[PDB]
Amino acid sequence: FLDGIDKAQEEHEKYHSNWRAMASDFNLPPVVAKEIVASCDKCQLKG
Amino acid sequence: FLDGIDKAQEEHEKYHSNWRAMASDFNLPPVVAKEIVASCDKCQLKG
Ligand SMILES: [Zn+2]
Ligand SMILES: [Zn+2]
């Protein structure tokens, strides 16, 4: 959980990619990829 | 991931408990419990 996300988290910061891209990059269920978006205030609160 | 969350998700709807309570209820890392909060618009956008 925290191990894969730590790597995927860096990819998110580099491009703010959507949870779908992160999910496919690490092949993790939407929950793990979507949780990273929830930690990103920029991608979470979008307006 | 989806199996435990499906059960934990119902507990969230019943009391909108914080991710800490859900994490302790199912002993899952903050990511899984915090992701459920992110799906709950009521607990996510709080003001
Ligand atoms: Zn972002
Ligand atoms: Zn809630």
Curated annotation (Swiss-Prot), chains A, B:
Where is Zn(2+) bound in this sequence?
A: H12, H16, C40, C43
What is this protein identified as? Integrase
What the entry says about domains is: The core domain contains the D-x(n)-D-x(35)-E motif, named for the phylogenetically conserved glutamic acid and aspartic acid residues and the invariant 35 amino acid spacing between the second and third acidic residues. Each acidic residue of the D,D(35)E motif is independently essential for the 3'-processing and strand transfer activities of purified integrase protein.
Name of the coding gene: gag-pol
Q: Which organism is it from?
A: Human immunodeficiency virus type 1 group M subtype B (isolate YU-2)
> Where do the ZnF regions (Integrase-type) fall?
3-44
State its role.
Answer: Catalyzes viral DNA integration into the host chromosome, by performing a series of DNA cutting and joining reactions. This enzyme activity takes place after virion entry into a cell and reverse transcription of the RNA genome in dsDNA. The first step in the integration process is 3' processing. This step requires a complex comprising the viral genome, matrix protein, Vpr and integrase. This complex is called the pre-integration complex (PIC). The integrase protein removes 2 nucleotides from each 3' end of the viral DNA, leaving recessed CA OH's at the 3' ends.
- Domain of life of the source: Viruses
**Subunit structure, as described in the record:** Homotetramer; may further associate as a homohexadecamer. Part of the pre-integration complex (PIC) which is composed of viral genome, matrix protein, Vpr and integrase. Interacts with human SMARCB1/INI1 and human PSIP1/LEDGF isoform 1. Interacts with human KPNA3; this interaction might play a role in nuclear import of the pre-integration complex. Interacts with human NUP153; this interaction might play a role in nuclear import of the pre-integration complex.
Q: Where is the protein localized?
A: Virion; Host nucleus; Host cytoplasm
